[PDB]
Symmetry: C2
Subunit: 260 residues, 2 copies
């Protein structure tokens, strides 16, 4: 009854107060800098209901991040086409997202697995104030098809509940952001579950938060709609952070407003 809409509120605020920039290469935006959206994960899985979000794509991109794979193959073979634009002829991206997550290179063999590291500190030292995972490796940036947008996150535990905050440097509010949210919300459910914890909040923090001019009307229509209760995440405990699979991950009671 009046479902919280912190994503739609930001969308709305940017449209009303954002600054307009125009290139003029036909890529006009209105934007705000340094904004935040928070969800209480216990009150529902934050897959938006004011338009449809393709959960299968969310799920599979995350799984692929988690494998440490710079090759787009497994994605194309599950009909996720998101990265296709950026791949070189052999399907390679250079060491984007999951390569940094799983194997940030040391000068000397040479891999730091931030994800195992994060989970282990969850288990042994949940009070840690340095439980952070970063993809923003300044010296590896030149090798990536492009530098990471969702670039760093931090874990936190209070009263047995796991919270996660994301720093995202650039946010296409209409197309990109609903996917980012679902996807880190799911990551945090994966951590909590493996660490034997409950879920707290997902906090999304944005740098340049922009609505493309070419999305003006789609935004006004999304914004004219009433939110429905969020769905609920059905997550089957895989053996480890790296052995989840599409079959473990469903959302139930998902009731999105129709296109467009």
């Amino acid at each position: 009854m009046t479902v919280p809409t912190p994503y739609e509120d930001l969308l709305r605020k940017i449209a009303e107060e954002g600054s307009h920039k125009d290139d003029r290469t036909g890529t006009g935006t209105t934007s705000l800098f340094g904004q935040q959206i928070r969800f209480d994960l216990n009150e529902g899985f934050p897959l938006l209901t004011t338009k449809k979000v393709h959960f299968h794509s969310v799920v599979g991109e995350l799984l692929w991040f988690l494998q440490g794979d710079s090759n787009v193959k497994w994605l194309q073979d599950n009909n996720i086409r998101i990265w296709n634009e950026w791949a070189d002829e052999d399907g390679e991206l250079g060491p984007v997202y999951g390569v940094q997550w799983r194997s940030w290179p040391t000068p000397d063999g040479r891999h730091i697995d931030q994800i195992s590291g994060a989970l282990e500190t969850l288990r042994n030292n949940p009070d840690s104030r340095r439980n952070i995972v970063s993809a923003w490796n300044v010296s590896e940036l030149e090798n990536m098809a492009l530098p990471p947008c969702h670039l760093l996150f931090q874990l936190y535990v209070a009263d047995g509940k796991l919270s996660c905050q994301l720093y995202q440097r650039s946010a296409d509010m209409f197309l990109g952001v609903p996917f980012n949210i679902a996807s880190y919300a799911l990551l945090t459910h994966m951590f909590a579950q493996q660490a034997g914890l409950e879920v707290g909040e997902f906090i999304w923090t944005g740098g340049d938060c922009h609505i493309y001019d070419n999305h003006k009307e789609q935004v006004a229509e999304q914004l004219s709609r009433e939110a429905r209760p969020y769905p609920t995440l059905e997550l089957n405990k895989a053996a480890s952070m790296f052995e989840y699979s599409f079959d473990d991950i469903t959302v139930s009671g998902y009731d999105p407003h129709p296109l467009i």
Copy 2:
């Protein structure tokens, strides 16, 4: 017009709503403070903040040298406990800002990069500076707290957002706010831009039990208007001095 108190606002919310943890703390996670830099420099008026200390740490970050010696000669003791017998910290903040190392033995000057991008590509969405070099953490005295920032320009105004993973609310954060507000003023001045907002975003934001009454007293005081920064343009980012940087119309309540 009232005086905006977003730092105190958050200080009060954590004291009221944070959860107590055992050196015990009370904390909230993922909080945001923002200042409009055109409306005053955010050096707090509800208690005196020692500016010289802020200025010096920053000038030292910017010089990229992680030896403590130059801080000591300028009367700042704040890094002494972390120093080794040689006054060496390992490659903390400024070594990363000025020289994040690459595998071929070269290095990246993120500050000059960031200033370049302001001058030549102000709209970039990748104007980032990071000190969170995961493969270098082993060698630092201490992992960076204020660990990454981003610059953004709109309507000829420079904004800056910082990500700080750990925030000693009573003691550290007032130094951190003034420190980055000043840094953003420096960037803006070297790039011929005006100032927009400084946006401080914290992870684990805490009040130590130790400070309960220091905090309560702070929270009982009425803010005076913020001072204004006086910034004499140096010849470059790396050439500012103490003499270039003062504050005017600073009317704080007393030290706590």
